[PDB]
Subunit: 103 residues, 3 copies
Protein backbone atom coordinates (compact mmCIF):
# COMPACT_ATOMS: atom_id res chain seq x y z
CA UNK A 1 0.00 0.00 0.00
CA UNK A 2 1.15 3.60 -0.63
CA UNK A 3 -0.10 7.05 0.24
CA UNK A 4 -0.20 9.34 -2.79
CA UNK A 5 0.14 12.92 -1.49
CA UNK A 6 -0.66 15.60 -4.07
CA UNK A 7 -0.19 19.32 -3.37
CA UNK A 8 -2.16 21.22 -6.06
CA UNK A 9 -3.64 24.59 -7.08
CA UNK A 10 -7.00 24.90 -5.20
CA UNK A 11 -9.02 25.45 -8.46
CA UNK A 12 -7.84 21.98 -9.69
CA UNK A 13 -9.54 20.06 -6.81
CA UNK A 14 -12.72 19.35 -8.87
CA UNK A 15 -10.65 18.10 -11.87
CA UNK A 16 -8.56 15.83 -9.60
CA UNK A 17 -11.62 14.48 -7.73
CA UNK A 18 -13.35 13.70 -11.06
CA UNK A 19 -10.24 12.02 -12.59
CA UNK A 20 -9.84 9.83 -9.48
CA UNK A 21 -13.60 8.92 -9.18
CA UNK A 22 -13.74 7.92 -12.93
CA UNK A 23 -10.94 5.34 -12.31
CA UNK A 24 -12.59 3.85 -9.19
CA UNK A 25 -10.59 5.86 -6.59
CA UNK A 26 -13.49 7.36 -4.56
CA UNK A 27 -11.77 7.61 -1.15
CA UNK A 28 -9.56 10.66 -0.42
CA UNK A 29 -8.58 13.06 2.41
CA UNK A 30 -8.28 16.79 1.56
CA UNK A 31 -6.45 19.46 3.59
CA UNK A 32 -6.17 23.23 3.01
CA UNK A 33 -2.46 24.13 3.14
CA UNK A 34 -0.04 26.88 2.07
CA UNK A 35 3.22 26.58 0.25
CA UNK A 36 6.14 28.04 -1.64
CA UNK A 37 8.84 26.91 -4.11
CA UNK A 38 9.46 28.23 -7.63
CA UNK A 39 6.44 30.66 -8.06
CA UNK A 40 5.52 34.04 -6.27
CA UNK A 41 3.43 36.09 -5.72
CA UNK A 42 1.98 39.53 -6.83
CA UNK A 43 4.90 38.85 -2.13
CA UNK A 44 3.02 36.95 0.69
CA UNK A 45 4.94 34.56 0.15
CA UNK A 46 3.00 31.39 1.11
CA UNK A 47 0.28 30.75 -1.48
CA UNK A 48 -2.91 28.73 -0.86
CA UNK A 49 -2.67 25.12 -2.04
CA UNK A 50 -4.77 21.98 -1.62
CA UNK A 51 -3.38 18.67 -0.34
CA UNK A 52 -5.09 15.52 -1.64
CA UNK A 53 -4.13 12.20 0.01
CA UNK A 54 -5.16 8.87 -1.49
CA UNK A 55 -4.06 5.55 -0.01
CA UNK A 56 -3.97 2.85 -2.70
CA UNK A 57 -2.58 -0.64 -3.48
CA UNK A 58 1.05 -0.69 -4.84
CA UNK A 59 -0.11 -1.60 -8.40
CA UNK A 60 -2.49 1.44 -8.60
CA UNK A 61 0.16 4.12 -7.79
CA UNK A 62 1.26 4.86 -11.39
CA UNK A 63 -2.42 5.10 -12.53
CA UNK A 64 -3.31 7.43 -9.61
CA UNK A 65 -0.16 9.61 -10.11
CA UNK A 66 -0.88 9.89 -13.89
CA UNK A 67 -4.59 10.73 -13.23
CA UNK A 68 -3.51 13.59 -10.86
CA UNK A 69 -0.71 14.91 -13.13
CA UNK A 70 -3.19 15.01 -16.12
CA UNK A 71 -5.98 16.73 -14.15
CA UNK A 72 -3.84 19.18 -12.07
CA UNK A 73 -1.29 20.38 -14.69
CA UNK A 74 -1.27 23.82 -16.38
CA UNK A 75 2.42 23.75 -17.46
CA UNK A 76 3.14 26.88 -15.34
CA UNK A 77 5.27 27.25 -12.14
CA UNK A 78 3.14 26.39 -9.09
CA UNK A 79 1.33 23.24 -10.39
CA UNK A 80 2.61 21.38 -7.32
CA UNK A 81 4.05 18.01 -6.40
CA UNK A 82 3.07 14.40 -5.80
CA UNK A 83 4.88 12.47 -3.03
CA UNK A 84 4.53 8.68 -2.75
CA UNK A 85 4.92 7.43 0.84
CA UNK A 86 4.92 3.75 1.97
CA UNK A 87 1.92 2.60 4.06
CA UNK A 88 2.49 -0.63 5.99
CA UNK A 89 -1.12 -1.12 7.19
CA UNK A 90 -4.43 0.47 6.19
CA UNK A 91 -7.27 -0.16 8.72
CA UNK A 92 -10.99 0.39 8.06
CA UNK A 93 -12.27 1.61 11.48
CA UNK A 94 -15.89 0.28 11.09
CA UNK A 95 -14.85 -3.35 10.43
CA UNK A 96 -11.42 -3.45 12.00
CA UNK A 97 -10.09 -5.11 8.89
CA UNK A 98 -6.59 -4.23 7.98
CA UNK A 99 -5.05 -4.08 4.49
CA UNK A 100 -1.32 -5.08 4.27
CA UNK A 101 0.82 -5.97 1.17
CA UNK A 102 1.28 -9.77 0.99
CA UNK A 103 5.13 -9.99 1.45
Amino acid sequence: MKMVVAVIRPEKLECVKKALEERGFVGMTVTEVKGRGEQKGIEVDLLQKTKVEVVVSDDAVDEVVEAIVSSARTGKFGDGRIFVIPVEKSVKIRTGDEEVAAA
Copy 2:
Protein backbone atom coordinates in the same frame (compact mmCIF):
# COMPACT_ATOMS: atom_id res chain seq x y z
CA UNK B 1 9.11 4.02 14.87
CA UNK B 2 5.79 4.49 13.05
CA UNK B 3 3.33 7.30 12.52
CA UNK B 4 -0.25 6.09 13.11
CA UNK B 5 -2.50 8.41 11.03
CA UNK B 6 -6.19 8.23 11.92
CA UNK B 7 -8.89 10.04 9.89
CA UNK B 8 -12.03 10.03 12.06
CA UNK B 9 -15.45 11.67 12.60
CA UNK B 10 -14.82 15.06 14.34
CA UNK B 11 -17.16 14.19 17.30
CA UNK B 12 -14.88 11.16 18.08
CA UNK B 13 -11.75 13.30 18.80
CA UNK B 14 -12.45 13.41 22.58
CA UNK B 15 -13.03 9.63 22.73
CA UNK B 16 -9.82 8.95 20.80
CA UNK B 17 -7.76 11.38 22.96
CA UNK B 18 -9.14 9.69 26.13
CA UNK B 19 -8.47 6.12 24.87
CA UNK B 20 -4.87 7.10 23.94
CA UNK B 21 -4.13 9.04 27.21
CA UNK B 22 -5.33 6.09 29.38
CA UNK B 23 -2.75 3.80 27.67
CA UNK B 24 0.11 6.32 28.15
CA UNK B 25 -0.03 7.89 24.63
CA UNK B 26 -0.24 11.61 25.45
CA UNK B 27 1.56 13.09 22.41
CA UNK B 28 -0.44 13.76 19.20
CA UNK B 29 -0.84 16.20 16.26
CA UNK B 30 -4.40 17.05 15.12
CA UNK B 31 -5.51 18.53 11.78
CA UNK B 32 -8.97 19.58 10.53
CA UNK B 33 -9.50 17.93 7.13
CA UNK B 34 -12.25 16.97 4.68
CA UNK B 35 -12.86 13.67 2.98
CA UNK B 36 -15.05 11.43 0.85
CA UNK B 37 -15.52 7.73 0.14
CA UNK B 38 -18.23 5.06 0.74
CA UNK B 39 -20.27 7.46 3.02
CA UNK B 40 -23.23 9.35 1.45
CA UNK B 41 -22.77 13.11 0.91
CA UNK B 42 -24.76 15.86 2.68
CA UNK B 43 -27.71 17.75 1.00
CA UNK B 44 -28.68 20.48 2.44
CA UNK B 45 -30.13 21.96 -0.85
CA UNK B 46 -31.75 25.14 0.62
CA UNK B 47 -34.29 27.30 -1.27
CA UNK B 48 -33.84 30.15 -1.75
CA UNK B 49 -25.34 22.87 -2.18
CA UNK B 50 -24.07 19.90 -2.53
CA UNK B 51 -21.25 19.34 0.07
CA UNK B 52 -19.63 16.08 -1.17
CA UNK B 53 -16.44 16.51 0.98
CA UNK B 54 -17.42 15.93 4.64
CA UNK B 55 -15.57 17.34 7.68
CA UNK B 56 -13.16 14.88 9.32
CA UNK B 57 -10.35 15.00 11.87
CA UNK B 58 -6.83 13.71 11.34
CA UNK B 59 -4.99 12.41 14.44
CA UNK B 60 -1.27 11.62 14.05
CA UNK B 61 0.61 9.70 16.74
CA UNK B 62 4.29 8.70 16.41
CA UNK B 63 5.10 5.58 18.48
CA UNK B 64 7.66 2.73 18.79
CA UNK B 65 7.08 -0.29 16.45
CA UNK B 66 5.87 -2.52 19.33
CA UNK B 67 3.13 -0.02 20.43
CA UNK B 68 1.40 0.23 16.95
CA UNK B 69 -1.12 -2.63 17.43
CA UNK B 70 -2.16 -1.20 20.85
CA UNK B 71 -2.54 2.39 19.42
CA UNK B 72 -4.49 1.07 16.35
CA UNK B 73 -6.86 -1.03 18.60
CA UNK B 74 -7.39 1.96 20.98
CA UNK B 75 -8.40 4.21 18.02
CA UNK B 76 -10.62 1.58 16.34
CA UNK B 77 -12.48 0.97 19.70
CA UNK B 78 -12.96 4.68 20.49
CA UNK B 79 -13.71 6.00 16.94
CA UNK B 80 -16.04 3.25 15.62
CA UNK B 81 -19.84 3.53 15.21
CA UNK B 82 -20.27 0.68 12.66
CA UNK B 83 -21.66 3.10 10.05
CA UNK B 84 -20.09 4.19 6.71
CA UNK B 85 -17.78 7.16 7.31
CA UNK B 86 -15.96 5.97 10.49
CA UNK B 87 -12.63 6.51 8.74
CA UNK B 88 -9.24 4.92 8.32
CA UNK B 89 -5.96 4.34 10.10
CA UNK B 90 -2.73 4.40 8.02
CA UNK B 91 0.60 3.21 9.50
CA UNK B 92 3.60 5.01 7.95
CA UNK B 93 7.33 4.32 8.74
CA UNK B 94 9.25 7.01 10.69
CA UNK B 95 13.03 6.64 10.39
CA UNK B 96 14.08 9.47 12.77
CA UNK B 97 12.22 11.39 15.48
CA UNK B 98 13.89 14.63 16.73
CA UNK B 99 12.87 16.56 19.88
CA UNK B 100 13.57 20.23 18.90
CA UNK B 101 14.20 21.53 22.50
CA UNK B 102 16.98 19.00 23.27
CA UNK B 103 18.22 18.16 19.76
CA UNK B 104 18.00 14.47 20.74
CA UNK B 105 17.20 12.16 17.84
CA UNK B 106 15.51 8.71 18.12
CA UNK B 107 16.55 6.22 15.39
CA UNK B 108 15.49 2.51 15.04
CA UNK B 109 17.80 -0.42 14.01
CA UNK B 110 16.76 -4.14 13.80
Copy 3:
Protein backbone atom coordinates in the same frame (compact mmCIF):
# COMPACT_ATOMS: atom_id res chain seq x y z
CA UNK C 1 14.21 11.03 -0.79
CA UNK C 2 12.70 11.89 2.59
CA UNK C 3 9.92 14.09 3.90
CA UNK C 4 11.09 16.14 6.88
CA UNK C 5 7.94 16.89 8.96
CA UNK C 6 8.48 19.57 11.58
CA UNK C 7 5.75 20.49 14.11
CA UNK C 8 6.70 23.90 15.61
CA UNK C 9 5.35 26.88 17.62
CA UNK C 10 3.38 29.14 15.18
CA UNK C 11 5.57 32.21 15.98
CA UNK C 12 8.65 30.28 14.74
CA UNK C 13 7.36 29.84 11.14
CA UNK C 14 9.15 32.98 9.86
CA UNK C 15 12.46 31.92 11.51
CA UNK C 16 12.18 28.38 10.04
CA UNK C 17 11.12 29.68 6.59
CA UNK C 18 14.20 32.02 6.59
CA UNK C 19 16.71 29.41 7.89
CA UNK C 20 15.59 26.91 5.17
CA UNK C 21 15.64 29.40 2.24
CA UNK C 22 19.14 30.54 3.45
CA UNK C 23 20.45 26.99 2.77
CA UNK C 24 18.73 26.66 -0.63
CA UNK C 25 15.58 24.86 0.64
CA UNK C 26 12.87 27.08 -0.91
CA UNK C 27 10.15 24.43 -1.37
CA UNK C 28 7.86 23.68 1.61
CA UNK C 29 4.22 22.83 2.49
CA UNK C 30 2.73 24.50 5.61
CA UNK C 31 -0.34 23.33 7.56
CA UNK C 32 -2.10 24.87 10.60
CA UNK C 33 -2.50 22.07 13.17
CA UNK C 34 -3.09 21.49 16.91
CA UNK C 35 -1.30 19.18 19.31
CA UNK C 36 -0.19 18.23 22.83
CA UNK C 37 2.39 16.18 24.74
CA UNK C 38 4.91 17.18 27.50
CA UNK C 39 3.88 20.90 27.34
CA UNK C 40 0.83 22.06 29.33
CA UNK C 41 -0.86 25.47 29.12
CA UNK C 42 -3.89 27.70 29.86
CA UNK C 43 -4.95 26.34 32.55
CA UNK C 44 -5.19 30.21 32.93
CA UNK C 45 -8.11 32.29 31.49
CA UNK C 46 -10.08 35.59 31.89
CA UNK C 47 -13.90 35.77 32.67
CA UNK C 48 -13.78 35.67 36.50
CA UNK C 49 -13.52 31.86 36.21
CA UNK C 50 -12.92 29.36 33.27
CA UNK C 51 -9.67 27.30 33.29
CA UNK C 52 -9.60 24.74 30.38
CA UNK C 53 -8.05 24.17 26.83
CA UNK C 54 -6.38 20.89 25.56
CA UNK C 55 -4.79 21.06 22.08
CA UNK C 56 -2.46 24.02 21.50
CA UNK C 57 -2.05 25.71 18.10
CA UNK C 58 1.03 24.44 16.21
CA UNK C 59 2.43 24.75 12.69
CA UNK C 60 3.45 21.80 10.52
CA UNK C 61 6.26 22.42 7.99
CA UNK C 62 6.90 19.65 5.43
CA UNK C 63 10.00 19.63 3.24
CA UNK C 64 10.81 16.84 0.79
CA UNK C 65 14.59 16.56 0.16
CA UNK C 66 17.29 14.12 -1.10
CA UNK C 67 18.59 11.64 1.55
CA UNK C 68 21.94 13.50 1.91
CA UNK C 69 20.21 16.86 2.70
CA UNK C 70 18.17 15.55 5.73
CA UNK C 71 20.73 16.28 8.50
CA UNK C 72 21.21 19.85 7.17
CA UNK C 73 17.37 20.46 7.00
CA UNK C 74 16.83 18.94 10.50
CA UNK C 75 19.69 21.11 11.98
CA UNK C 76 18.33 24.27 10.27
CA UNK C 77 14.84 23.66 11.79
CA UNK C 78 16.21 22.71 15.26
CA UNK C 79 18.33 25.96 15.35
CA UNK C 80 15.54 28.30 14.13
CA UNK C 81 12.57 26.74 16.05
CA UNK C 82 14.12 26.10 19.49
CA UNK C 83 13.42 28.19 22.65
CA UNK C 84 14.59 25.59 25.19
CA UNK C 85 11.10 25.38 26.73
CA UNK C 86 8.58 22.47 26.69
CA UNK C 87 6.47 22.63 23.51
CA UNK C 88 9.20 23.44 20.92
CA UNK C 89 7.97 20.50 18.85
CA UNK C 90 9.19 17.48 16.92
CA UNK C 91 10.77 16.57 13.61
CA UNK C 92 9.74 13.28 11.96
CA UNK C 93 11.67 11.91 8.97
CA UNK C 94 9.48 9.81 6.65
CA UNK C 95 10.67 7.93 3.49
CA UNK C 96 9.47 9.25 0.10
CA UNK C 97 9.66 6.66 -2.70
CA UNK C 98 8.63 8.93 -5.62
CA UNK C 99 8.50 12.72 -6.03
CA UNK C 100 6.60 14.05 -9.09
CA UNK C 101 6.73 17.62 -10.47
CA UNK C 102 3.18 18.13 -11.83
CA UNK C 103 4.11 20.74 -14.51
CA UNK C 104 6.64 18.50 -16.30
CA UNK C 105 5.41 15.03 -15.27
CA UNK C 106 9.02 14.23 -14.29
CA UNK C 107 9.29 11.74 -11.44
CA UNK C 108 12.30 11.40 -9.02
CA UNK C 109 12.84 7.82 -7.71
CA UNK C 110 15.84 6.37 -5.76
CA UNK C 111 18.33 4.50 -8.01
CA UNK C 112 18.94 0.97 -6.47
CA UNK C 113 15.36 -0.31 -7.10
CA UNK C 114 13.56 -2.01 -10.05
CA UNK C 115 11.90 -0.56 -12.08
